[PDB]
Amino acid sequence: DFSAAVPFLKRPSNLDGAYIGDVGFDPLGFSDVFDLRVLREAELKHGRFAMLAVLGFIVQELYTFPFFPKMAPVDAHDYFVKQGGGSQIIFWISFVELFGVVALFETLQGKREPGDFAFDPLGLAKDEATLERYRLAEVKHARLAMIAIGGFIHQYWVTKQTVLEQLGNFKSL
Amino acid sequence: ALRTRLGELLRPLNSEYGKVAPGWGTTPIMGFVMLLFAVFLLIILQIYNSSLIIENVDVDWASLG
């Protein structure tokens, strides 16, 4: 019983400390049923989408462009579904995911770390220690934003108020 | 036995004859899903049988309009 995060559940068989953020948290059987590389790739993609979504949820409420009407983010999804901008965003996300398919195929073969697209224009994470610290921060922020975006969306669906609009004048249910 | 393009395309789908999982496999999951299906069938049967009224559900021709 040495899972190191849940003391009574033991370390999972393939959850060695090779991966960043590996605290042994896998109570249900998922790493023993699916490839860990694919799981890490899916985790990073979900978390990056969630981080961008949380930042967008803040910014769109705080400021919307001179163009487009003043809308809440969910109403924004509906309006851009009916307008055509959502189709453009879906088209370009699908275009990037077309090569993401090949990247995941490589990850299945090897020669590519899960979630590694070699995207680093500003030249950050110089030296390995800084890279490991940034990896840990990235994974933690990814999971936190994965929880937070669902929190934002379900709270808007329940209270009919946006997040910072809800922070003041809470109006408890 | 004739070899064909469609035959070799579909051959792996008909390759693991008699291959079985170890003892009892995923039987409890199948039993649980069958129990859920039985409950669902009972619900829908009692709905039309009128022995079960849920809300805003009128089993009647007049509900058409």
Binding site: N14, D32, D35 | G18, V20
Partner: peptide, 26 residues
Amino acid sequence: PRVYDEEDQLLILSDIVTFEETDLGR
């Protein structure tokens, strides 16, 4: 993700139960 039943299940037993003949039957 990261055994064969080996039973025919199409087999009739197909074993003939022989009956002997006695002097009375002869």
